Amino acid sequence: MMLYIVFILSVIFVMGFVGFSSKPSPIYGGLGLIVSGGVGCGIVLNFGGSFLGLMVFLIYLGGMMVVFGYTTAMATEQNKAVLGAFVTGLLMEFFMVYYVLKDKEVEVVFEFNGLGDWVIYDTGDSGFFSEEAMGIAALYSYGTWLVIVTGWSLLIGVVVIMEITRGN
Amino acid sequence: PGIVELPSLEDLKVQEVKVSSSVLKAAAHHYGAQCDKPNKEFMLCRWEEKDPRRCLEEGKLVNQCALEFFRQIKRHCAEPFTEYWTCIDYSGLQLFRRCRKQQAQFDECVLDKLGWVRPDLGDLSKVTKVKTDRPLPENPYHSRARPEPNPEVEGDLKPARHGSRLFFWTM
Amino acid sequence: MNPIIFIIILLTIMLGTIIVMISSHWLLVWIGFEMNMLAIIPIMMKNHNPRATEASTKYFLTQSTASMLLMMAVIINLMFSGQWTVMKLFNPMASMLMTMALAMKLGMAPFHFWVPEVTQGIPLSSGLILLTWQKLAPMSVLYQIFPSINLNLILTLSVLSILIGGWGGLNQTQLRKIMAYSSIAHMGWMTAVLPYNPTMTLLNLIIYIIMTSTMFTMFMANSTTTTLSLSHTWNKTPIMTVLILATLLSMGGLPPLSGFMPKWMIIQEMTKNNSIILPTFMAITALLNLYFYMRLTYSTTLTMFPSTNNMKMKWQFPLMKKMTFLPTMVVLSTMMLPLTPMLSVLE
Amino acid sequence: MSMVYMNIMMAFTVSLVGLLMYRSHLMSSLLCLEGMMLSLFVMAALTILNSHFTLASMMPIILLVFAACEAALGLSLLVMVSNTYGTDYVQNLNLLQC
Amino acid sequence: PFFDVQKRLGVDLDRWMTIQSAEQPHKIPSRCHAFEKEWIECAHGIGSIRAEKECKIEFEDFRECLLRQKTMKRLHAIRRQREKLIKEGKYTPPPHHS
Amino acid sequence: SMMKWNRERRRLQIEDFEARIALMPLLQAEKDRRVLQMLRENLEEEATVMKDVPGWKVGESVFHTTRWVTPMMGELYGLRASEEVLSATYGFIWYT
Amino acid sequence: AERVAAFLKNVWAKEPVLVASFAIAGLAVILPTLSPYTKYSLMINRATPYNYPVPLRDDGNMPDVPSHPQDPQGPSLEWLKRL
Amino acid sequence: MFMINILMLIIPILLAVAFLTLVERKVLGYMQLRKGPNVVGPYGLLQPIADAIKLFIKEPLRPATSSASMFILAPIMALGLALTMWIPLPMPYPLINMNLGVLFMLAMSSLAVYSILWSGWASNSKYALIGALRAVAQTISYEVTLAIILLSVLLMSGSFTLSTLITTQEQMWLILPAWPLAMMWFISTLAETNRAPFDLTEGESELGFNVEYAAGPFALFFMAEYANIIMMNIFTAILFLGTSHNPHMPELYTINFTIKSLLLTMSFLWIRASYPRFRYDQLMHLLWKNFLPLTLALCMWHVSLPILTSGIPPQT
Numbered sequence A: 001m002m003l004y005i006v007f008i009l010s011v012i013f014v015m016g017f018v019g020f021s022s023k024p025s026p027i028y029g030g031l032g033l034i035v036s037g038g039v040g041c042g043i044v045l046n047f048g049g050s051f052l053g054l055m056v057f058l059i060y061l062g063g064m065m066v067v068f069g070y071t072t073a074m075a076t077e078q079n080k081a082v083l084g085a086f087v088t089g090l091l092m093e094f095f096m097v098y099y100v101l102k103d104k105e106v107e108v109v110f111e112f113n114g115l116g117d118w119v120i121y122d123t124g125d126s127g128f129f130s131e132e133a134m135g136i137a138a139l140y141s142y143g144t145w146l147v148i149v150t151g152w153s154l155l156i157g158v159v160v161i162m163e164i165t166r167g168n
Numbered sequence B: 001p002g003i004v005e006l007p008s009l010e011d012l013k014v015q016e017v018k019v020s021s022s023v024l025k026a027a028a029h030h031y032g033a034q035c036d037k038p039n040k041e042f043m044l045c046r047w048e049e050k051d052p053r054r055c056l057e058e059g060k061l062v063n064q065c066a067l068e069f070f071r072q073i074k075r076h077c078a079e080p081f082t083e084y085w086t087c088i089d090y091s092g093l094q095l096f097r098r099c100r101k102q103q104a105q106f107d108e109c110v111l112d113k114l115g116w117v118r119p120d121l122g123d124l125s126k127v128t129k130v131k132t133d134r135p136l137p138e139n140p141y142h143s144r145a146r147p148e149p150n151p152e153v154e155g156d157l158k159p160a161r162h163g164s165r166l167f168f169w170t171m
Numbered sequence C: 001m002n003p004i005i006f007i008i009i010l011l012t013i014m015l016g017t018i019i020v021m022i023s024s025h026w027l028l029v030w031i032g033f034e035m036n037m038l039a040i041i042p043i044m045m046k047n048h049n050p051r052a053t054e055a056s057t058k059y060f061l062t063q064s065t066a067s068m069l070l071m072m073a074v075i076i077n078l079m080f081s082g083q084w085t086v087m088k089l090f091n092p093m094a095s096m097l098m099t100m101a102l103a104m105k106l107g108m109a110p111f112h113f114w115v116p117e118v119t120q121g122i123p124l125s126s127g128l129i130l131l132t133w134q135k136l137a138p139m140s141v142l143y144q145i146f147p148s149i150n151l152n153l154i155l156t157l158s159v160l161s162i163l164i165g166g167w168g169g170l171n172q173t174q175l176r177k178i179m180a181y182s183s184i185a186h187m188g189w190m191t192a193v194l195p196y197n198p199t200m201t202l203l204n205l206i207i208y209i210i211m212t213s214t215m216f217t218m219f220m221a222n223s224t225t226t227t228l229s230l231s232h233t234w235n236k237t238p239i240m241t242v243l244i245l246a247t248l249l250s251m252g253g254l255p256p257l258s259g260f261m262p263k264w265m266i267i268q269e270m271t272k273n274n275s276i277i278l279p280t281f282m283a284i285t286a287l288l289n290l291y292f293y294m295r296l297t298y299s300t301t302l303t304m305f306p307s308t309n310n311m312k313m314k315w316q317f318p319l320m321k322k323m324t325f326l327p328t329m330v331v332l333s334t335m336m337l338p339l340t341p342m343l344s345v346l347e
Numbered sequence D: 001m002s003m004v005y006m007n008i009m010m011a012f013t014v015s016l017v018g019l020l021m022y023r024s025h026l027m028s029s030l031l032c033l034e035g036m037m038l039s040l041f042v043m044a045a046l047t048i049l050n051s052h053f054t055l056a057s058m059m060p061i062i063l064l065v066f067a068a069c070e071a072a073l074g075l076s077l078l079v080m081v082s083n084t085y086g087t088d089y090v091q092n093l094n095l096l097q098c
Numbered sequence E: 001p002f003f004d005v006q007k008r009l010g011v012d013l014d015r016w017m018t019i020q021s022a023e024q025p026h027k028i029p030s031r032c033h034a035f036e037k038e039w040i041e042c043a044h045g046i047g048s049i050r051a052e053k054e055c056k057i058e059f060e061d062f063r064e065c066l067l068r069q070k071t072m073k074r075l076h077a078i079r080r081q082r083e084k085l086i087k088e089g090k091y092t093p094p095p096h097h098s
Numbered sequence F: 001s002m003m004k005w006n007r008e009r010r011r012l013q014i015e016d017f018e019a020r021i022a023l024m025p026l027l028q029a030e031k032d033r034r035v036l037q038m039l040r041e042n043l044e045e046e047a048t049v050m051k052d053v054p055g056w057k058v059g060e061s062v063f064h065t066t067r068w069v070t071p072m073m074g075e076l077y078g079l080r081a082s083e084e085v086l087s088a089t090y091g092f093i094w095y096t
Numbered sequence G: 001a002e003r004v005a006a007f008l009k010n011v012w013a014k015e016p017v018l019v020a021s022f023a024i025a026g027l028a029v030i031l032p033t034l035s036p037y038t039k040y041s042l043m044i045n046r047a048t049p050y051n052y053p054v055p056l057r058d059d060g061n062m063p064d065v066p067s068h069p070q071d072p073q074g075p076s077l078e079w080l081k082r083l
Numbered sequence H: 001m002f003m004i005n006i007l008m009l010i011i012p013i014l015l016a017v018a019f020l021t022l023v024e025r026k027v028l029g030y031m032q033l034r035k036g037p038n039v040v041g042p043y044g045l046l047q048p049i050a051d052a053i054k055l056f057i058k059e060p061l062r063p064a065t066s067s068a069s070m071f072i073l074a075p076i077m078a079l080g081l082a083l084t085m086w087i088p089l090p091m092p093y094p095l096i097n098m099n100l101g102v103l104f105m106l107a108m109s110s111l112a113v114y115s116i117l118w119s120g121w122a123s124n125s126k127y128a129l130i131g132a133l134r135a136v137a138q139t140i141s142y143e144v145t146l147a148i149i150l151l152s153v154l155l156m157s158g159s160f161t162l163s164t165l166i167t168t169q170e171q172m173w174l175i176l177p178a179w180p181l182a183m184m185w186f187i188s189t190l191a192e193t194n195r196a197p198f199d200l201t202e203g204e205s206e207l208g209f210n211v212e213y214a215a216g217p218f219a220l221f222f223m224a225e226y227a228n229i230i231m232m233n234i235f236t237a238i239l240f241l242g243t244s245h246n247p248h249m250p251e252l253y254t255i256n257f258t259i260k261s262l263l264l265t266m267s268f269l270w271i272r273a274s275y276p277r278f279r280y281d282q283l284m285h286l287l288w289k290n291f292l293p294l295t296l297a298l299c300m301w302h303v304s305l306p307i308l309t310s311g312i313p314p315q316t
């Protein structure tokens, strides 16, 4: 059952989404989105992306999601619909999991397969480097245009937010 | 479509070189300065044929030179070499700089017994040329003929015949 | 707001739209949209009142959702074709989300409920940017991916926009809402001819921008935002009522004014493709637009509405508003029909 | 496609439906908006890593940087909505009907 | 592009990451470099109307190397047949497959 | 002090990298024979498993082209032990 | 000449931290242009052999390409052993 | 054997934290002209054990928390993450030999803010929330300088591997070429772990967030907090005081490396006894107006310095 680690994580990934998509109180909604983020990194790590997976923890979970929780505790004033949506979500997940595990082929918009994610991995690698790392480091040698527009947007984010929040 | 052709289990059989990565890494520098010619022919075959089934015979020649290379060490410099890769094998990273003292003995032993000179820094990374009788492949990608281009427009650009010809406009 | 920061924010709105138009990569197209939405919110919040805050919120949620759908189309297109180039999409499901993402950004029906409300809650100058400049970026992408757009989807969004823009405008007295519904109606024409001749999509866009910019400029000069407040203009600036009459008649497509040119050329490019029912239905439904335009002509220029006593104090001061390019825009909005064959410069 | 893609692709659908059905809180919907980018982040990274599209390994990071900048702009509006009506309820934002 | 500023100025703003067979750092190839190259060279210059018909063979191969749909169907068939014969005493896996 | 030591470390990296280059020809030859053998081993089992199926060709390519295509994990370790498959798929990612 | 001294001696007294920050950042932008060893950084980076040196088929007219690694022809890392 | 390895790392950590409480109370005592614990066992060697038993058989409060599930999640997360930050530390051989270990420690360290934020919610007290917000704003502010300073140091090392920092310092400590960064790294670690002169949480007369906790749950927050004090000082010694590694005598490394890690942990106790406390607005200005301008400037200097001297480290 360790060969299907990626699929097991993806199932937990969806269940978390059904958690905060049903929209419980914001405190619990943010809690469910942290669980999905951690599971999301786990999936990316098992596909060979280590820098990308860790960037999720540092920037997404330890960054944005901290600001989300920080802003919730200060501007949120700490039902049947929630339970109804949550139960509806799990049932659809169960049936999708049930069928892809029975006949190993499901057609919903796209043709999905059920053999196992491991069957599409590359079979040959003998490099003395990390291919993912080389691509990201190319941001400075190849992505000159990307660096300029991204940096300017971040600078404008500082200017814009101060304008919006002044109130006068 | 077609049927993928594969060589037979008896066409792949060859005498393997069963020595650990520490043994290879200890003899790597001398190995690359002695078996360069059979090695580079095989690599030229792979980067040109782009198909491992087309370079099996060159592959066996690579194996034979390695077996013959290690036998010469087995005859003349065995204790110095066995003591060299034992120190390399001890480190988790298999570092050269931790075993300079044992390297000198093995390097000196081969020099006297076989006249082997260790290549200098930057030699094994040089692009070289290999003389091979194997013909150059013509269509290595097995590509079909490209669709012919559209007819090109050529001639003199004369003014429009009576102008725009848009409804009632006369020019 | 500091004047220098106002210039910087505006140039970032332009830069976002320019990045979309000069990019051969879907990531830079998406970055262009994001830089555009980030910069335009501060000009909508500039007056610091609850209505502006509500308008900026409804705009953010709509444009944020649209951008997420667009990025989902790009990734699906990457999975099925292994490339990022800005061209026809290679999956029908990617095309639907891409076509629907752009429809939401444009404001086409039935993704239209935010255009009347956002345009109403922001100043006139911000509305002018929203209804003219913000339409360039989505139309640039449609110009490039039209070979793969679902015909029944693009023509269905076009027809609903023409209808909903027409009926929505009849029941309005606020000027900002009238232009918003007018903007929805004209979008349907631009996307109706897109499968057949994209050149006429640009011509209708160019003409619409010129005419719409003229109307907002004249409203801003007198600080008029309601039908009644606009009816005092005859007693303050008589000339400005004659210019409003001419532009309103132009926007309705009445010959021999400029606004008849796109409606004329779009009907031509659809009858060549044996499309007879749609152009007729489109042309007849456009009479709804001409109606509530004519209503403003009755209460502004063709009749003299009641005035107030304090109006006499206004006669002693001039107009100090900029009214930039107003003389040039008004002439281009009314007197360009004899130059119709010039549309070939857009090819 | 593959078995993992189904759940990632179904996680985007859940968040989209969650974003299109507001309950009361504005903060709740912003989470559904940041869930959408998380699914897109994972789905793109899976495609890029598996195909050895080396130069595209930087794209998911750019997706994360802009999506977080957009999220910051969203939270700022939520704060300014709460400083006016005392809560982040969407039903309060109904002045523009007329 | 709507405006071809890059071609006019001869500046490569974003064309280096459009395709996965372009120049990659350290010459690292993508898994489907050969298939992408073949389709690109087939469809070059003849417009997309013709390429949709006269380069369909290459395109189907490229899409087979991307999503591997046909291969997974074939492996799935073999696994079922082996499983069916396994639970009847009619098959015997060889020693090196166990 | 840092400049000197870093410069010595680059000369050491080249020495370590050149050892890999000197060995790649031998490792490439071994890998080619190991990949082909596993493909042939699967070919035999496919023939036995599907000798009586309604219209099945043994070892039929799914590509129109006849060019060599690198096998994926499913084609090599399709019918092997889970432990061996687990090592060849997640072994590197899970090592320490 | 006296205006600058008065200005510099005032920030050095009231804002020593900022004065240090700009001096350090200013050196990071200037010295690489004037440094004679910046060219050796590129040569070291180009000399590192990550990939395999694929050999070239011999045609006869290639006197600058060695037939063996230990031949004297081709690029040399002698400058690196002495750096 | 790996499972035995994990326990050989966890239990000694907790024991070290237990006796750090004693050492802290006695070093503070002698700097104050007194003794500290010397009655409960010889030289107070049984004082830590008495304190542990007392807390775990004392009745807990568990007030009417708004959730009652965050109240139990907060100490699990704090202690769980605190032990996890030890697994990649080379002493000299890591339990888990990560390639991006330095980045792993930043990632896990930035998650410790949730236990501060969650415990604020659970307390159900409006005032206790304000204290949690100030603590959270302090932690995120000072991990901006931890990330940039670490990046500057790694430019002289070449990788995010923690064991490569040992090779980098095989001729000389990094404290010599990068002492200005070491100063701002050392102070940034005090602010992260809410240590004097940066302990506003425990700094009564202005506020703490863990005020509603007593007995065992309180000890769990305490244990996690002190394990982070040891861990950050072990990180500092590896980063700036590299110890030479002899593969044949690895114990030689561990003894020297432990002595450095202790001396840096005692420096934390030394600094607590010597200075008064910062004001909240004053430690924020120490970061956004003094450290950050220098950290950004030194980052520019350290990106360019290796290039202009031809001293770029190897990638591997």
Ligand SMILES: CCCCCCCCCCCCCCCCCC(=O)OC[C@H](COP(=O)([O-])OCC[N+](C)(C)C)OC(=O)CCCCCCCCCCCCCCCCC
Pocket (backbone or CB within 6 Å): G014, G015, G017, G020, G024, G027, H175, H180, H182, H183, H184, H186, H187, H197, H236, H240, H271, H286, H290, H291, H294, H301
């Ligand atoms: C050739 C190229 C060379 C390039 C590099 C050149 C570098 C030149 C030197 C630059 C300055 C060096 C930076 C030092 C850090 C300055 C930070 C700063 O902001 O200072 C002002 C700051 C505050 O300055 P301030 O409060 O006095 O005022 C700031 C400015 N005004 C007046 C406008 C407000 O000082 C502090 O950081 C306060 C310290 C808090 C208490 C810390 C307790 C110290 C305990 C002793 C620890 C000793 C270190 C142990 C290290 C152990 C490591 C293993």
Ligand SMILES: CCCCCCCCCCCCCCCCCC(=O)OC[C@H](COP(=O)(O)OCCN)OC(=O)CCCCCCCCCCCCCCCCC
Pocket (backbone or CB within 6 Å): G011, G022, G023, G024, G025, G026, G027, G029
């Ligand atoms: C070419 C590539 C590099 C291009 C870099 C261009 C971008 C630079 C980005 C810098 C970062 C942004 C900082 C800009 C703000 C400057 C400070 C400021 O805002 O001015 C405030 C100050 C207020 O004045 P006040 O307090 O009333 O009175 C005392 C003032 N001294 O008013 C003042 O009087 C401050 C005076 C202006 C500050 C000038 C700073 C110049 C820094 C350059 C120094 C380089 C020297 C390097 C050589 C060192 C050799 C040892």
